[PDB]
């Protein structure tokens, strides 16, 4: 059994691309991420998503954006995609000016809080560290 | 009723606790691989199987190159977290 993906629109693909961080963060510029965001925009365009790229958002602007997206009418959309490109820690993504709990972002789309996405796939794609361990690999 | 946490999928670039790697010119290993597998397989494979190809591509085709020995020759495995209740196909 498989999700209904023949609604009139495949849905939104939100891309939050954070490259430049306030010096208060002590966090380096993320060279290469513009290439990522452009690749994602073209990829999801070919999948018939309505793509919205946003760049260099604070933690408050991320929360705001997600709240606003979550209160849109998704009735005619098959799914929702959010791509986050930034620095991170376990459970955390960084706005330009500081960290944000990933749970605070995804909670806006819970089945009881975003009724027009109830029963529809909500995909979060997260390019960000989750700690500071390194995998040395095995031959 | 359904669970309020149902029908989420979190495609993480790396395993819990680990760094995630990015190339200053080509982009992050994970996004490069994700876009390439979606381009190659979105009309062919279910989404979880596409992400499994992304896992293999990140795991086998990338290894870090660093002038700092501490960060040199390192590897990465992405982490698929699925609370989905159905198969997901981007084709008809």
């Amino acid at each position: 059994n498989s999700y209904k993906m023949d609604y009139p629109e495949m849905g939104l693909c939100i891309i939050i691309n954070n490259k430049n961080f306030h010096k208060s963060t002590g966090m380096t510029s993320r060279s290469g991420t513009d290439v990522d965001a452009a690749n994602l925009r073209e990829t999801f365009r070919n999948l018939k998503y309505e793509v919205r790229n946003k760049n260099d958002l604070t933690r408050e602007e991320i929360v705001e954006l997600m709240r606003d997206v979550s209160k849109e009418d998704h009735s005619k959309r098959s799914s929702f995609v959010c791509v986050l490109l930034s620095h991170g820690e376990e459970g955390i993504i960084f706005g330009t000016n500081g960290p944000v709990d990933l749970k605070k972002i995804t909670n806006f789309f819970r089945g009881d809080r975003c009724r027009s996405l109830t029963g529809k796939p909500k995909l979060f794609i997260i390019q960000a560290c989750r700690g500071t361990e390194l995998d040395c690999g095995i031959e | 009723k359904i669970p309020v946490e149902a029908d989420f999928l979190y495609a993480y670039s790396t395993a819990p606790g680990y760094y995630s790697w990015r190339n200053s010119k080509d982009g992050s290993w994970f996004i490069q691989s994700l876009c390439a597998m979606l381009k190659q397989y979105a009309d062919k494979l279910e989404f979880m199987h596409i992400l499994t190809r992304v896992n293999r591509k990140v795991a086998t085709e990338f290894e870090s190159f660093s002038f700092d020995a501490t960060f040199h020759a390192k590897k990465q495995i992405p982490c698929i977290v699925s609370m989905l209740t159905k198969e997901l196909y981007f084709y008809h």
């Binding site: 560290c129 | 790697w21 990015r22 870090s64 960060f71």
Partner: peptide, 5 residues
């Protein structure tokens, strides 16, 4: 150049 996020 490879870098961590």
């Amino acid at each position: 150049v490879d870098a961590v996020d």
